[PDB]
Amino acid sequence: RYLDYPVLWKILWGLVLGAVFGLIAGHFGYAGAVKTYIKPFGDLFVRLLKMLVMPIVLASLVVGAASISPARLGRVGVKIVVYYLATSAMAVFFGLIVGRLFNVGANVNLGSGTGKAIEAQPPSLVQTLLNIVPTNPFASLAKGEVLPVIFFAIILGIAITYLMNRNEERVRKSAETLLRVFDGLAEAMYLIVGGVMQYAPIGVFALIAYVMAEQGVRVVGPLAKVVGAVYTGLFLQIVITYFILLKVFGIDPIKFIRKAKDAMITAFVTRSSSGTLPVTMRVAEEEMGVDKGIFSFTLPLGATINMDGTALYQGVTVLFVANAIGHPLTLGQQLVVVLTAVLASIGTAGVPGAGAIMLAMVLQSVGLDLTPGSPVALAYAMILGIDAILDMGRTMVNVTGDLAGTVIVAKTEKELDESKWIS
Amino acid sequence: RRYLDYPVLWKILWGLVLGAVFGLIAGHFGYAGAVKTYIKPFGDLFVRLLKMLVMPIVLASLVVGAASISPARLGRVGVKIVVYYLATSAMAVFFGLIVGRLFNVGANVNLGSGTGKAIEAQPPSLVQTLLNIVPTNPFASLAKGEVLPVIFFAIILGIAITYLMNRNEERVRKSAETLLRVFDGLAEAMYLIVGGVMQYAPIGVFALIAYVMAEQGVRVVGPLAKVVGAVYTGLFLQIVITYFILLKVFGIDPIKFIRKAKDAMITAFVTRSSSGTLPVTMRVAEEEMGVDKGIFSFTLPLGATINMDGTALYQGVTVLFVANAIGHPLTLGQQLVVVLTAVLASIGTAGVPGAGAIMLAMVLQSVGLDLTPGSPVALAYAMILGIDAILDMGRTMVNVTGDLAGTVIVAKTEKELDESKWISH
Amino acid sequence: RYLDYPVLWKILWGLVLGAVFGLIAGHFGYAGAVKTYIKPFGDLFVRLLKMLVMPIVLASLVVGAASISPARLGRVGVKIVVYYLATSAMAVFFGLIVGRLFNVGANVNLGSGTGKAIEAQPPSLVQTLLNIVPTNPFASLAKGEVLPVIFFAIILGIAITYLMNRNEERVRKSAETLLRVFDGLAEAMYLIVGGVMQYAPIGVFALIAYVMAEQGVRVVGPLAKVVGAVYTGLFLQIVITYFILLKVFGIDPIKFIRKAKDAMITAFVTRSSSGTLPVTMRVAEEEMGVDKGIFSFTLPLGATINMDGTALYQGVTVLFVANAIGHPLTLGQQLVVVLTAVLASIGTAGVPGAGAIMLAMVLQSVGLDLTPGSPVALAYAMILGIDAILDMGRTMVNVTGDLAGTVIVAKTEKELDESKWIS
Ligand SMILES: N[C@H](C(=O)O)[C@H](OCc1ccccc1[N+](=O)[O-])C(=O)O
Ligand SMILES: N[C@H](C(=O)O)[C@H](OCc1ccccc1[N+](=O)[O-])C(=O)O
Ligand SMILES: N[C@H](C(=O)O)[C@H](OCc1ccccc1[N+](=O)[O-])C(=O)O
């Protein structure tokens, strides 16, 4: 008797009601009950999404790479990579701007020196690039490594397309049967995503309630100033960067938002970019009208290697730590911050738990060495106090940038269905 | 070579009885090492051949069955089979307590204990176990052999395929039908391989029962022998009283059910593995009981996972044994708490690895028998574990039998039972 | 632009140029640079090959077992097993012969007694044989265990063949759909192998360059005698054993060599038999002309349990250590060496980390006990100093013996396409 409501209003009601409920319940100390009784529902939602993340990626990408030309796929890849890099750089730049504007960490008033530390910690870039190529596709599937799955699925789709054009008949029949199996699997995955979207309001409610109950009291003082700065920066990235990029390519951005809102809310409430990937892919297919050969490749790669929100988060937090210990970053230092942030988003591709690694590398690039007990470690733990509050918004902005790049590359290659954008 | 020329049913029965007598004779004379070195490998090969098929057959059969059935009908089937499982488990602990008090298990152990109720062993939170039913990676759940997430994913996939095959578009319907045909072929090949392995099954049953009797045959004396007798009488009671009455009230002739299930029964008994017998149990369900895939392809793996009436009866006997051993006999209310906590542990230990010791520890803790090292209750528990395999054979047999009985009952209720298989002449 | 050249001439140029380049660069001490800048390309090539091993083996073997009779498959298995054992015995024989000819270890002049014994237990044959039978096919696929995959694929193919001959019609359609899926997967895998063969020159160059740069300086004194002995023994095994076996069965050996050249070079540069397995399978089908039901089963089993090169290597190294410590092996001890070497190649079938277990087993079989600090341990580390130079040839000869056995069994079963052998 609950499914009778519109799903969009249901997800919005879930979000707002969970926010207010978690805030009031954490302000009254019953947050444990929220962790005991309310959070399991959001946990169930996130588990249902993670269940679908891998098969949908495999099947959708093999089908899309099959139903497209290799030169087209390479052109799409170069376009989407240039887009991702430009958006990440603009995100770090906006983050530094809003950090210097809010003067984040100015009132922390901590004392620190130049006590250095050596680190050979950055993961080898060559080894990660090699690790893009799996040594066992079944293992990469079981271990949930998305980039090896992308590589294997693209190669398999290209092979299937080359196989269906043979003078022999057995070869064409077998290749077409395989492609039909993969297509049925992908369609079933999208249907199951649509089905799970009915439980999404309860999951959003529970997740936002737990997050607000736990870390709602901690957003005071300089941490509150940082929260305001990061949210202003994310809003700035969205509006300025994404809307300008969309209108330049002649697409209505407000409709883009009305379509992406589902993936936006899901990414925001789950704080997992790759975990929302099924919802983002469904939004690409059955609302925006993007061709499979575009998004089935750009969206997983975007969720993996394109994080504008985290880029802006690092850009603001480095200035916060700098002003906290009393060593504000110079202009050249901020330029180095932007450069090392993009280089860390690229060099930590698929490396597990890279957010702390990326932030440590960004701090190292300017000299802020994360030695235990040091004041910089104190400021970093201060930030990790509100890390989840920031993670919601940064994940939302990451998935939004991914979707914007996908639709832009589709509009360029004329693979975008305009019927869904004219009402 | 010319060994398949005999009926495979008589062959597995002969294997069982000859291996039982052979293991008893070889273990009573101390030659158990030779049996462990030369004879057991064949039973190991049999159990490995059976384990090989468990995952693909379950996945494919359940995807096909959930596809070829209605979602509301499947949910009704789930509710029916779950209430059946719980009622049978409760009756099983009740029978176990009855036969334990009748045999007076543990009376002559004569151990000393006080009221020193020490607390240990934080139980894993139930909510996380319930959530773990939903997989986070189907490929990973397949590789790890986790049965319940595979069940969930397969049900969802079958429902999706059925709803996909009824679309106004035509290409999508063809693709969905191709996928369903792939799963159907995989399942049929798996059942054919189960039938093939059933020809080697006599050697496996012989070797397994021989090894078990050789190892733990000398240890079934005194109070441990009384426990063996009590638990086997209780398992026989559960079979006869509970299962036959449940079948006859629902209008099924129980002797036919037993004569058909005997293959899976013998396999479960000799292998002591429920999920390892699951392929044989499903083939018996299809080609003997006449159950539709949409019923058993869902109820039989879930039953092998979360329905163990034999283990409930085993706990009902062993808790009374330990209580009488340490000299603190269980009251009637304590025995009711035993039954309730045993059913609740069969529910709360769904798919958690190594959950049998967890369940027994929980039932012992629920009455105060706390397993502190060196304590008398731990001593009595190790005394029981001395004959663990001897008891495991029968309890596994009864688990698989209860699973099959529930599946057949729920199938007959949903009209998915083929009555042609039940008419003589 | 660069693919416009014949790929065979390209891989040969890569091999020889990389050999000379690594030799020149290691004689000047800059070999570290080769490990930093050159080796990643060979690593990429080897990972691209590792990616394909599981899908190609699974699909090819299920298809071949389907498209063949079970009795024929068993006869082929018996033939190929007898071939493998005979070739391994001949390999240890040639190793002992060339070792006695080169007098390996004579000038080491080490001192040893009859002291303390070590016992690397041989894996019990029963447990390994049982582990051939998987308990979970998905797990064996993810873990890359080849023999359980072989067993499961053979059983599945036989089941599909028995299913296609049933009175029911839906069952035949489903079985044919499944077999078509597997066939398409196998054909796509072979197409991808052909594609990777275009990058193969760079990988071959990089691998041989790294191996020569690292272990090029190490070929001095008795180690040079060991290198010469093992290479002469492998050359003899090829010419004497394999050519005679091929000509006896009415096959032209020079044609076999000219066809196997691709898998030979790949195995040589990658030193991995199972990693070269896709190239060997493609060469077997589309050059040698063997039916799927033959090679799709014999070639993986050969890569797993047939290693003539390693057998000859052990035959040489045992004599080397014996002459090093000053206790030359008697004739009966050398016979025990060959017997235990064949029995260890059989008893370490699919057991992880073999060859070290096998060599320890042979040394225990003659009494040379590998206790740490002992002179035998010193000589063994002396040998392991140049392990890769020998490993190249050992892997090449292993895959060559596998291919020769496959072609011989095909000629016997008349499953060999003679058109591919007509000039
Ligand atoms: N989890 C957030 C997100 O949804 O992007 C965000 O990125 C984490 C991150 C970074 C690099 C590679 C992969 C991931 N990852 O997906 O955990 C963060 O924690 O700040
Ligand atoms: N071993 C018997 C069987 O399952 O066949 C039976 O159950 C043990 C049990 C319990 C829970 C999860 C898994 C298992 N398991 O498979 O060992 C028993 O010993 O009473
Ligand atoms: N690597 C060589 C080869 O390609 O055969 C050769 O065998 C190693 C070996 C042995 C047993 C199982 C697997 C492997 N393996 O593939 O590393 C060697 O190192 O001497």
From TrEMBL, chain B:
Gene3D superfamilies: Sodium:dicarboxylate symporter
Gene Ontology cellular component list: membrane; plasma membrane
Protein name, per record: Proton/glutamate symporter, SDF family
Location of this chain's protein in the cell: Cell membrane
Pfam families noted in UniProt: SDF (PF00375)
SUPFAM superfamilies: Proton glutamate symport protein
GO biological process, one term: dicarboxylic acid transport
Record's keyword annotation contains Acyltransferase: no
Keyword annotations: Cell membrane, Membrane, Symport, Transmembrane, Transmembrane helix, Transport
Primary location recorded for the protein, binned into one broad class: membrane
Membrane disposition: Multi-pass membrane protein
A GO term for molecular function: symporter activity
TM annotation in the entry: 6-29, 49-69, 81-103, 147-165, 186-211, 231-250, 336-362, 374-391
